[PDB]
Amino acid sequence: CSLLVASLAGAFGSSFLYGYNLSVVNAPTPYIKAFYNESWERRHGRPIDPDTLTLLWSVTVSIFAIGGLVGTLIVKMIGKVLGRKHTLLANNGFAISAALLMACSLQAGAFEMLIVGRFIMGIDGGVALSVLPMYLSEISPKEIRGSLGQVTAIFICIGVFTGQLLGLPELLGKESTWPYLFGVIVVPAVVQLLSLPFLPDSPRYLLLEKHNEARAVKAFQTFLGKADVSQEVEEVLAESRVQRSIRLVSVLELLRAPYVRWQVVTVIVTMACYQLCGLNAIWFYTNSIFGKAGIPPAKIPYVTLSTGGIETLAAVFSGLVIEHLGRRPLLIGGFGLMGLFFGTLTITLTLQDHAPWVPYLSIVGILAIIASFCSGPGGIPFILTGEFFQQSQRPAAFIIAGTVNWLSNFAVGLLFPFIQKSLDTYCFLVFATICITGAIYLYFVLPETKNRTYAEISQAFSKRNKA
Ligand SMILES: O=c1cc(-c2ccc(O)cc2)oc2cc(O)cc(O)c12
Missing domain, CATH: 1.20.1250.20 (MFS general substrate transporter like domains)
Known part of the structure; x- marks a missing residue:
């Protein structure tokens, strides 16, 4: 309720x-x-x-x-x-x-x-x-x-x-x-x-620093649907004590730290590849992309609607696929399928004039691109990002990932029209190269992270840290 x-x-x-x-x-x-x-x-x-x-x-x-x-x-x-x-x-x-x-x-x-x-x-x-x-x-x-x-x-x-x-x-x-x-x-x-x-407000916010015992208790009672919430209060208080017993680390100190250099490079590259893949580019310029594929202008908005619908359906399917496949195989498969479908998109855009039914192949290719995105690396990079670090909720990590996320979105948004201006019939090769490079890197580097403790993944990363 x-x-x-x-x-x-x-x-x-x-x-x-x-x-x-x-x-x-x-x-x-x-x-x-x-x-x-x-x-x-x-x-x-x-x-x-x-x-x-x-x-x-x-x-x-x-x-x-x-x-x-x-x-x-x-x-x-x-x-x-x-x-x-x-x-x-x-x-x-x-x-x-x-x-x-x-x-x-x-x-x-x-x-x-x-x-x-x-x-x-x-x-x-x-x-x-x-x-x-x-x-x-x-x-x-x-x-x-x-x-x-x-x-x-x-x-x-x-x-x-x-x-x-x-x-x-x-x-x-x-x-x-x-x-x-x-x-x-x-x-x-x-x-x-x-x-x-x-x-009611956030109970954790009310108890970490506000120290509103009655307000936090009421918030837990309302949100959890039960009057027995004392155990959760004690658990969050213990978590607060544990966090206060640990010294906070700055973004600059985290960057200068040698034992997390590989982790920060991995997260930066994951965000860069997740936002330079070009899904936001298509979302911005769907009308132009579908127009350049030879589809008559009388149907472009409806096909864009189909894109949105399949993207939501892929999200719904991912909501259950994620819990059963994993993180690393899912990410690698998602990026590799992005690369292969970008290849089929460019081979169906280069020769659109040979047959009438080729633009339909372009639409199907874009369909599968968005499905492979939203069912694959669409959401995991926002969980895995925390999953790397030992603290697992580092503000420095969320500052160093979001910066690259937004800057890469900026680069894609401001350069995609010019990419098209340069490569009218090949403009997806750049995104295909980016996606395949990201897949290769995270296949040779990123280890599996589902049902794994932070200690073991830290040990695996230190095996490569040369420290
Ligand atoms: O939590 C996020 C989820 C999404 C997202 C966007 C499209 C999808 O099909 C699935 C997830 O993008 C993001 C982009 C950001 O810059 C930050 C986010 O937390 C998210």
């Missing part, structure tokens, strides 16, 4: 918006480009030559990455005081401000407004996904935590799906309706503001 309500509310407040804004920029792309052309003609009197327009569009699409980067560093200062629930409500405030700055951008005719709104709502994204997971884990019993991890994954997926859905030409794709594309964001924010504050 209360558990499910809180889970749905938090996910809808943060991860749903992140997924929506991940793939809401593709459907109105031609209209926004026309707006850029018109605004520049008004302001300067000279039309934009196409490469400058493509660069401006790339900046607009990819500045979300820098927004998320600065979010995943402002969260460190915010969470020390604002907690979890109030942090999510402030996140809601960013969402309101950013959505309103989006909606009024067209009529005012100042694209600077759109850029600043994108940056703010990117800060929203980085504050969202670094506060939601801890809250979701903390408000749930031990036996269900993995289920809520799959819940946040599924809500990100459904946010992407509904973003690809609302971009349909009939609903919110017309020339007189596209501003409502960044005006829908108000509703999830409003419902989150109306739902979340009527729930």
Whole structure:
């Protein structure tokens, strides 16, 4: 009851918006480009030559990455005081401000407004996904935590799906309706503001430093559905004592430490390959990719909808495949299948003219690419990242992984149009090479981590640390 309500509310407040804004920029792309052309003609009197327009569009699409980067560093200062629930409500405030700055951008005719709104709502994204997971884990019993991890994954997926859905030409794709594309964001924010504050805070947050015994006890009683929660309180107090008995280590000291150099290189490379694979690239430029494959323009939005649907279905299937296959074989198989399907995509795009039914092969290839992603390395890199380190929840680790995550997303978003401009019919070879290289590296380096203690994996890594 209360558990499910809180889970749905938090996910809808943060991860749903992140997924929506991940793939809401593709459907109105031609209209926004026309707006850029018109605004520049008004302001300067000279039309934009196409490469400058493509660069401006790339900046607009990819500045979300820098927004998320600065979010995943402002969260460190915010969470020390604002907690979890109030942090999510402030996140809601960013969402309101950013959505309103989006909606009024067209009529005012100042694209600077759109850029600043994108940056703010990117800060929203980085504050969202670094506060939601801890809250979701903390408000749930031990036996269900993995289920809520799959819940946040599924809500990100459904946010992407509904973003690809609302971009349909009939609903919110017309020339007189596209501003409502960044005006829908108000509703999830409003419902989150109306739902979340009527729930108890994070009990762990209330007991680690707030020391609110009665409030924490009430929160455990409400969330766990039982009045016998003293054992959990004692367990979390013991965990707090253990953590306070261990000295914290800084990011710079962690980097200078020789016994975790291989671990940090592994996590950095895993994040770089998980975000340079190009799934976010397709999510941003699905319309352009499917148009360049020879599919008639009359059906591209529907095929994009199919992409979103299969991506959500792959998430649902992964939610159970993960618990039974593993981590290292799953990651290696996912990246290798990414490479092979990128090869079949380029062999079906290079010779699209030979037969009429080749674009259908392109669609099937993209289908399988997204399925292999979302059922494979789609979610594990966010668990394995903690799993490497001995502490297993290192803020330095989550600072050194998120930085590379957001910078790689920035690189992909700002360079994919130019990659296409260079390699119209081969632009997926670069992503295929990246994916295969990542697969090779993590096959020769990363050892299996399921049902393994941190001591054994530390021993295996030290076997290569030469120390
Ligand atoms: O927890 C996360 C989950 C996802 C994700 C995105 C798409 C999927 O089909 C499954 C998971 O991306 C992320 C990207 C980030 O930069 C940070 C995350 O925590 C996540």
